[PDB]
Design a protein around this ligand. Structure first.
Ligand SMILES: Nc1cc(Cl)ccc1Nc1ccncc1
Length: 283
């Protein structure tokens, strides 16, 4: 079926939970043996969220190459994304090592450091120009260059230096700051505006390594971001945009990381975002 009318048909019939459970039942199951080794327990935020072995990102280290991060490679859309958990106190250096080694231009953050009164990820970037951060375990330096605070999101320019080679690179930090502590946003308008700002920066384009995107577990909000982006790109590329099947795209993405889209409300919000986004692209 088309998307907008399949949408109204699920609303009128109130069957979002049943649709979402079908997706959970059909989703791929692949091994995640490296994630579950005992030496990696303190590298995982949640015991039930792990990268598959076949798609995990490897750190360029001979001691321990493990990080909780997955490469989502969308062949028809010609887009790749790295989805990862919010960094832990003991994995902030690994996180920036990955950004460096994978040649990423941008980092997309979809959570606040504290939500619901608890810490959802480490404070992993500097908040003042004159107070830079040094990660001694991975030999990297990170400096805040500039910050632009808007009503729904903040964009930061950062300098990452590899202290071993003295090479430097400019990294863009796109921070969506207004996702509610509970539920999903009422309108997709600010989320779509944010996605378009990331696109306009070049961070999603083939001349760079994959964008790094995270929330707290790296599957819920993060899944919503890449699902919406890929579906809108496919609608632009195909002769028949109504052929794009968001459930099929989500199941394809779940071949590369488990659990993408965590609730039926996030599924409905993803449909809403793609539907509204497809009108603005054209009007
Ligand atoms: N809207 C639309 C519908 C059909 Cl059937 C064919 C072409 C368009 N136009 C497009 C196509 C691809 N990308 C943008 C616009």
């Amino acid at each position: 079926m088309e998307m907008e009318k399949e949408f109204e048909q699920i609303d009128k019939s109130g069957s979002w939970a049943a649709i979402y459970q079908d997706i959970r039942h059909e989703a791929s199951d692949f091994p995640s043996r490296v994630a579950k080794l005992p030496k990696n327990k303190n590298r995982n935020r949640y015991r039930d969220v792990s990268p598959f072995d076949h798609s995990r990102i490897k750190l360029h280290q001979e001691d321990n190459d493990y990080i909780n991060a997955s490469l989502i490679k969308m062949e028809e859309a010609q887009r790749s994304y790295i989805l990862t958990q919010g960094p832990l106190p003991n994995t902030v250096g690994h996180f920036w090592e990955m950004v460096w080694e994978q040649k990423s231009r941008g980092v997309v953050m979809l959570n606040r450091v504290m939500e619901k009164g608890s810490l959802k990820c480490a404070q992993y970037w500097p908040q003042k120009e004159e107070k830079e951060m040094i990660f001694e375990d991975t030999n990297l330096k990170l400096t805040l260059i500039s910050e632009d605070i808007k009503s729904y999101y903040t964009v930061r320019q950062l300098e990452l230096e590899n202290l071993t080679t003295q090479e430097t690179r400019e990294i863009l930090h796109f921070h969506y700051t207004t996702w509610p502590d509970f539920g999903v946003p009422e309108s997709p308008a600010s989320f779509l505006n944010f996605l378009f700002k990331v696109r306009e920066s070049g961070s999603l384009s083939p001349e760079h390594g994959p964008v790094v995107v995270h929330c707290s577990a790296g599957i819920g909000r993060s899944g919503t971001f890449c699902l919406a982006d890929t579906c809108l790109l496919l609608m632009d590329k195909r002769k028949d945009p109504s052929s794009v099947d968001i459930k099929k795209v989500l199941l394809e993405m779940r071949k590369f990381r488990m659990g993408l889209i965590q609730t039926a409300d996030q599924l409905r919000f993803s449909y809403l975002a793609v539907i509204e986004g497809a009108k603005f692209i054209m009007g």
